[PDB]
Design a protein around this ligand. Structure first.
Ligand SMILES: *[C@@H]1O[C@H](CO)[C@@H](O[C@@H]2O[C@H](CO)[C@@H](O)[C@H](O)[C@H]2NC(C)=O)[C@H](O)[C@H]1NC(C)=O
Ligand SMILES: *[C@@H]1O[C@H](CO)[C@@H](O[C@@H]2O[C@H](CO)[C@@H](O)[C@H](O)[C@H]2NC(C)=O)[C@H](O)[C@H]1NC(C)=O
Ligand SMILES: *[C@@H]1O[C@H](CO)[C@@H](O[C@@H]2O[C@H](CO)[C@@H](O)[C@H](O)[C@H]2NC(C)=O)[C@H](O)[C@H]1NC(C)=O
Ligand SMILES: *[C@@H]1O[C@H](CO)[C@@H](O[C@@H]2O[C@H](CO)[C@@H](O)[C@H](O)[C@H]2NC(C)=O)[C@H](O)[C@H]1NC(C)=O
Ligand SMILES: *[C@@H]1O[C@H](CO)[C@@H](O[C@@H]2O[C@H](CO)[C@@H](O)[C@H](O)[C@H]2NC(C)=O)[C@H](O)[C@H]1NC(C)=O
Ligand SMILES: *[C@@H]1O[C@H](CO)[C@@H](O)[C@H](O)[C@H]1NC(C)=O
Ligand SMILES: *[C@@H]1O[C@H](CO)[C@@H](O)[C@H](O)[C@H]1NC(C)=O
Ligand SMILES: *[C@@H]1O[C@H](CO)[C@@H](O)[C@H](O)[C@H]1NC(C)=O
Ligand SMILES: *[C@@H]1O[C@H](CO)[C@@H](O)[C@H](O)[C@H]1NC(C)=O
Ligand SMILES: *[C@@H]1O[C@H](CO)[C@@H](O)[C@H](O)[C@H]1NC(C)=O
Ligand SMILES: *[C@@H]1O[C@H](CO)[C@@H](O)[C@H](O)[C@H]1NC(C)=O
Lengths: 196, 186, 233, 49, 49, 49
């Protein structure tokens, strides 16, 4: 639809330019060959000067509205040259720039006077409720996860990544230690296993 | 009106131009505000870790379901009757010479319902509602992953949580005073 | 009848844009108001002629009891007189809509009307008019120790269309204004250089249309081929 | 014997510089780089993976 | 004399509106990028949000 | 010489811009075309002078 509306606006403007050649603008005719075959040179000038003035007006209005319309195809072609660099030749972190979801890759296809981009994205499906906690107190020390969240299936405590449920055992090689236990609002007693 | 017929079609062409402008003003609003297809509501509990969002969330004690800050903005943009839109636009009784004002498609209370669904989805979900289905997370645990995205470790949030929530609350309080003084930024 | 009090030597009043909007009658020295007789536009709502042929008509800013007399409904065709009076009459902020059925549902917008009202062709089949809906309600189950984690995913592929160039035209300025006549083109020389100005503007548009395509498509300068054995996992 | 540059009162349409077959060769060289080499061809020489 | 004088004042008014409307269009495309990248996400672009 | 298919009640033919493109001889009753003669569509390729 966005490509067809450009062809429709560029054709209404050229049909208005042809149709305005059949207006007389105050003269005795719209045909220039009938003014010239009916009037002597002094009288003819006053009639051809009305056609010249009115037809110069029609060309001037066409050209002005083509300059405004060409300035927004240039804005739209600069956006498409940015999406070719950042969505096709790279992987983008800007939200909703290349599609809907988390961007993986894009594929460029050619259309008439245009371009079509096929955005491949990642969408997260069915979810589940869990219980969570900001930190875990073990030996008078708080432990925070290195990359993930602390979840609980009801009895045990795991650590998982944020975009896929894949729970694991809380060891000292996926957490880190800082500070005391009385400073974190919501800390939870559990054990931190030691792999060595 | 019969001498005007000699100038061809200069007036189906001028009305065609002002209608493309008017159709485009409605596409401008749906581009900005209509970016979610679910209308989220915020829960009646307000345990947001100590962060106080009462001045930007809507209150039901008004017919216009706008927030407190959204009402200082609406009593600040005005007109000194310097032209013609005050003579026709906001209502009507018609004006002379064939000049009219068309109404927008989304009303002013439809736009405020859109910006309360973006606020309720940020506070309760984080960023997950803009990429799929909204998955809830506690608000202090959400703020620790935004510290972690600027290069500060997440234990700096939890150890300074009461101080961080106090600096935020006093900074929303100064937005009002910069919008209650008559020296308007609008 | 008016509320204004003139000074006793003033004959008529004006407003900010200098239009007459109050007058004094020269026999009983009272002040009258002037208000224009009502006008507006007539818009026709159709579902497309590949589908049906019934339409609805919107009359802007009327109040809708003035519709049969604002148009000349006694002087119109009997197939035009159906759309001035009926059971399907609805008064909106955008004007008054005649020929559509005011349901109480809410759907997505199909043909916009204004101030929150849309119109579509579903229901046999008829033309309806409804307040548009923004989306389904929802509520997130927020609490201070609850999280939701996804357990599966979905690979999605969408599509985005962008215009890049447009049609390159050119006008011979002398042949359009007066082709082949040589006593006209001697009169066109008295208007200065308007034909070199229009050609220079239209040429710069056409050269830009080719620069628009170089910057989108011609970003790499090696022409890679794809291998014949397509083992892509 | 149609010369119809002079048949529409001066109005013409100029053809584009890149044909529709040259544009389709550009978009298949962009795919033949993404599929075989990732994002490395947009920052240097293409390295396969 | 009055018809051509009044057509010119309408023509001037409509051309100024087509240039102002192209500027609100550029400012509403910036506001739709700040809603997606600052409100619906977290931005790394310096001085954008 | 034209091969337009007139009817026996015609003196000339027209097009969209209301210009005469075909006419009939008032003696031999023959339909012939009219087409202009300038050919202004001429471009000049050059290096510098
Ligand atoms: C929570 O997860 C733990 C860890 O897997 C579950 O404990 C195991 O449950 C299975 C049941 O199929 C037993 O065979 C294992 O021996 C259990 N292991 C331990 C260490 O307890 C536990 O059942 C889960 N709880 C719930 C409510 O789902
Ligand atoms: C989590 O574990 C800590 C340490 O085992 C508990 O802290 C102790 O609680 C008992 C009973 O309240 C006190 O007598 C001790 O003095 C506490 N120790 C310290 C170092 O403060 C803590 O209560 C546990 N949390 C819960 C909810 O049971
Ligand atoms: C959130 O901040 C607002 C700031 O306006 C607090 O509302 C004020 O609360 C104080 C204490 O009762 C009153 O003296 C003011 O009159 C209140 N102002 C308004 C406009 O209501 C509000 O209490 C804060 N919320 C929480 C939970 O602390
Ligand atoms: C113009 O003449 C008429 C006709 O007499 C005046 O109208 C009368 O004015 C008197 C006031 O002296 C009223 O009591 C009458 O009711 C009016 N009507 C008639 C029918 O007598 C009118 O006042 C004059 N206007 C002027 C002098 O400005
Ligand atoms: C994740 O979703 C996919 C589909 O989106 C699931 O695969 C389906 O599995 C069921 C039962 O095994 C089949 O009936 C469907 O035909 C499968 N779909 C496809 C496309 O093959 C998959 O099982 C889901 N993952 C989990 C863990 O349930
Ligand atoms: C999580 O819990 C809430 C209420 O406890 C419930 O409405 C919601 O559906 C649950 N989530 C899932 C994925 O079942
Ligand atoms: C709609 O238009 C298409 C376009 O050719 C035509 O083929 C078809 O018969 C039309 N009618 C329908 C789909 O009822
Ligand atoms: C429209 O009609 C109602 C019906 O009485 C009337 O009360 C109202 O004033 C009218 N509105 C106008 C004329 O603007
Ligand atoms: C729609 O709802 C309003 C609300 O009161 C009611 O008055 C009206 O009758 C309803 N319209 C119908 C049932 O067509
Ligand atoms: C979390 O919410 C529960 C239920 O309202 C409340 O009892 C508990 O005190 C809250 N946690 C903290 C740390 O305040
Ligand atoms: C007119 O005269 C010529 C003589 O050369 C003749 O050929 C032609 O048929 C005549 N046309 C008529 C009588 O309509």
């Amino acid at each position: 639809g966005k490509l067809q509306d450009v062809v429709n606006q560029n054709a209404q403007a050229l049909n208005t330019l042809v149709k305005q050649l059949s207006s007389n603008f105050g003269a005795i005719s719209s045909v220039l060959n009938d003014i010239l075959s009916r009037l002597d040179p002094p009288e003819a000038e006053v009639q051809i000067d009305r056609l010249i003035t009115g037809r110069l007006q029609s060309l001037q209005t066409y050209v002005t509205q083509q300059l405004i319309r060409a300035a927004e195809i240039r804005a739209s072609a600069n956006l498409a040259a940015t999406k070719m660099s950042e969505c096709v030749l790279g992987q983008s972190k800007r939200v909703d720039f290349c599609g809907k979801g988390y961007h993986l890759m894009s594929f460029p296809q050619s259309a008439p006077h245009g371009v079509v981009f096929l955005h491949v994205t990642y969408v997260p499906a069915q979810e589940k409720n869990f219980t969570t906690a900001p930190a875990i107190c073990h030996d008078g020390k708080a432990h925070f996860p290195r990359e993930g969240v602390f979840v609980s299936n009801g009895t045990h405590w795991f650590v998982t990544q944020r975009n896929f449920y894949e729970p694991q055992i809380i060891t000292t090689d996926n957490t880190f230690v800082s500070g005391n236990c009385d400073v974190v609002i919501g800390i939870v007693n559990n054990t931190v296993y030691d792999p060595l | 009106s019969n001498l005007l017929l000699q100038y061809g079609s200069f007036c189906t062409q001028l009305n065609r131009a002002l209608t493309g402008i008017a159709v485009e003003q409605d596409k401008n609003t749906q581009e900005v505000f209509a970016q979610v297809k679910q209308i989220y509501k915020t829960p009646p509990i307000k345990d947001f870790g100590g962060f106080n969002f009462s001045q930007i969330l809507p209150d039901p004690s008004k017919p216009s379901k706008r927030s407190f800050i959204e009402d200082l903005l609406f009593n600040k943009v005005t007109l000194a009757d310097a032209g013609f839109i005050k003579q026709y636009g906001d209502c009507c009784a018609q004006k002379f010479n064939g000049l009219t004002v068309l109404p927008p498609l989304l009303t002013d209370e439809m736009i405020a319902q859109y910006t309360s669904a973006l606020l309720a989805g940020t506070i309760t979900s984080g960023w997950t509602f803009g990429a799929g289905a909204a998955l809830q997370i506690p608000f202090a645990m959400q703020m620790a992953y935004r510290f972690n995205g600027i290069g500060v470790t997440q234990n700096v949030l939890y150890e300074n949580q009461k101080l961080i929530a106090n600096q935020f609350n006093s900074a929303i309080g100064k937005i009002q005073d910069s919008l209650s003084s008559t020296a308007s930024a609008l | 009848e008016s509320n204004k009090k003139f000074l006793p030597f003033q004959q008529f009043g004006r407003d900010i844009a200098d239009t007459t909007d109050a007058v004094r009658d020269p026999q009983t020295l009272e002040i009258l108001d002037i208000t224009p007789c009502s006008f507006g536009g007539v818009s026709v709502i159709t579902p497309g002629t590949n589908t049906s042929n019934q339409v609805a008509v919107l009359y802007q800013d009327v109040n809708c009891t003035e519709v049969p007399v604002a148009i000349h409904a006694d002087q119109l065709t009997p197939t035009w007189r159906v759309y001035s009076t009926g059971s399907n009459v609805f008064q909106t902020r955008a004007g008054c809509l005649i020929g559509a059925e005011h349901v109480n549902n809410s759907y997505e917008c199909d043909i916009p009307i204004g101030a929150g009202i849309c119109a579509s062709y579903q229901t046999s089949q008829s033309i309806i008019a409804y307040t548009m809906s923004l989306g389904a309600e929802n509520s997130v189950a927020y609490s201070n120790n609850s999280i939701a984690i996804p357990t599966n995913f979905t690979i999605s592929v969408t599509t985005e269309i962008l215009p890049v160039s447009m049609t390159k035209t050119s006008v011979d300025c002398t042949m359009y204004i007066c082709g082949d006549s040589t006593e006209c083109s001697n009169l066109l020389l008295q208007y200065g250089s308007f034909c070199t100005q229009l050609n220079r503007a239209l040429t710069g548009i056409a050269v830009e249309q080719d620069k628009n395509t170089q910057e989108v498509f011609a970003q790499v300068k090696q022409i890679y081929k794809t291998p014949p054995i397509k083992d892509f996992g | 014997d149609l010369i119809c540059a002079q048949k529409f009162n001066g109005l013409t349409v100029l053809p584009p510089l890149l044909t529709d077959e040259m544009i389709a060769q550009y978009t298949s060289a962009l795919l033949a780089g993404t599929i075989t080499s990732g994002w490395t061809f947009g920052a240097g020489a293409a390295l396969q993976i």
